[PDB]
Ligand binder design. Structure first.
Ligand SMILES: [Cl-]
Ligand code: NA
Lengths: 217, 219, 217
């Protein structure tokens, strides 16, 4: 139903101790990256937010983060979901600490939200109050600054991004042009925490507006 | 069955009367582009043709147009379909005129056509007599020149494209290498108006002949 | 069920005589290749192996080979499957021989292997004892050298590639970074035949270990 949280689910997690040099090379790891933490889940942008959160209190870097074509509902295998993320760290223990923070965040109540009665339209309107090292890098902002992380299906997202930019004192940092691999779209916008919150609220309202009257015209 | 029209459907439409400067920049709007029209539908190449037509009937430009991975039948949300298009214009009235022209074209009888009994093979063989500003730029030809707009699933398309090029005095302007995002293939071909139509007819017949005998010499 | 072969299927085959100059140019055909053989199937990496085998038994080159977004299970038309391949040869006779050799290999008992009861996790761990001209070119090795052709879903593949590289005297030749169009991943590894075999065995065991305990870390 409208405003229901879509629960995100972790599907697989593994640690690699002593990654092989060939893989370190293809993954373009830094010399001090000895261990990898691998994770897949059925919701990509939640997982991206969670990996970024893990970087704040552990010595891990997000070295790989990709979404699957056509999303988790079209996955052909059980563990592919719609995202793969890889953390790299100095040891299996520090990687485990990052993975633990990732899982905790994924289960913290964050998630996409339904915009209508049968949950056939959903969006992500997440106020990242202080970025870690991953989203700060991708958005081009300093670690510790705020983002609105806004995602919705393509038309909803273009419409609602415009609404969010008009409603709030925020800047466009990164545009997820439609389609992403999952056939969504959105952006990372930056500003103060209150401005990012105002952008999240406006984005959510606008997606719901489209959902209620898609063909108004 | 064979030759049945696959009806295209519009799923959502919206106008933005005056776009935020931030979005105007990311969408690379022209300075006089104040307003946007957004549309999604369940058939990408028909929508691209329709948007091109809108640039002829109203003072609008196609500023964004992309297809969705694995097509409308695999859409995970209600309005994603398999295409998003964005028209930009000087005011909401011109954008509204462009969107109306787009919707009119989509319901005009143009569409993909079935090639077999259960409609599991389909193709597009559309002769654009006079391109607007969108398909001309996509093909690299002058606005107003003609196009054969040919799309089919990968093997059918490669076979039928080769057949069309032999059948008519046309040149390949843009190759849609398999897979497109929707797992189709095809091309935009140009030439005189009669040659583009001759190519369309040849493309259609060639797709049909594969569809009628998918394993070729293996029976 | 676990260790079942997943049967691959050919969906469409067609021969062209005297390809158009325009299509010959776009496919970068050799001047004397006047004939094309088109094939589609529902399993991409098996078909890529089969096309490479065809180049050993007939005077054909692989000139096109691509996978479809989201795999055969999500195909929207009857003949798209998840792969298109194109063989080129001097005449329909050579192309016909190559297509027959491709079909015979696809029907030879090669295939992805199931890792669980409902065949919702599967992997490919194929030792190519003697490459043809297609996979040797893709891997950057001399024609006739051996390959381990290793494919699995994204997390399984990264984990199991690391296991394969550690288990045998092999080098990574080509990395299929997740996602491929079909939302798989893997690599081509080379070495001696026994080392490629050792890599395949290690890859298969590692994929199975993830399938048996996906969330244990
Ligand atoms: Cl044939
Ligand atoms: Na599907």
């Amino acid at each position: 139903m409208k405003n229901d949280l879509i629960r995100p689910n972790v599907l697989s997690v593994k640690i690699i101790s002593n990654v092989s040099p060939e893989m370190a090379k293809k993954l373009e790891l830094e010399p001090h990256h000895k261990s990898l933490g691998l994770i897949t889940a059925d919701c990509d942008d939640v997982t991206y937010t969670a990996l970024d959160e893990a970087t704040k209190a552990a010595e891990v870097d997000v070295v790989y983060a990709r979404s699957m074509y056509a999303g988790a509902g079209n996955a052909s295998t059980k563990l592919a979901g719609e995202v793969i993320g890889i953390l790299a760290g100095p040891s299996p223990a520090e990687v485990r600490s990052g993975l633990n923070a990732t899982l905790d965040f994924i289960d913290s109540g964050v998630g996409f939200v339904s915009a209508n009665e049968d949950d056939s339209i959903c969006y992500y309107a997440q106020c990242v109050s202080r970025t870690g090292s991953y989203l700060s890098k991708t958005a081009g902002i300093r670690e510790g600054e705020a983002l609105a992380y806004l995602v919705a299906p393509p038309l909803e997202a273009m419409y609602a991004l415009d609404a969010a930019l008009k409603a709030a004192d925020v800047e466009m940092c990164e545009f997820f042009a439609p389609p992403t691999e999952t056939n969504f779209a959105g952006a990372l916008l930056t500003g103060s925490q209150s401005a990012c919150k105002a952008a999240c609220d406006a984005f959510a309202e606008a997606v719901q507006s489209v959902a209620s009257n898609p063909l108004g015209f």
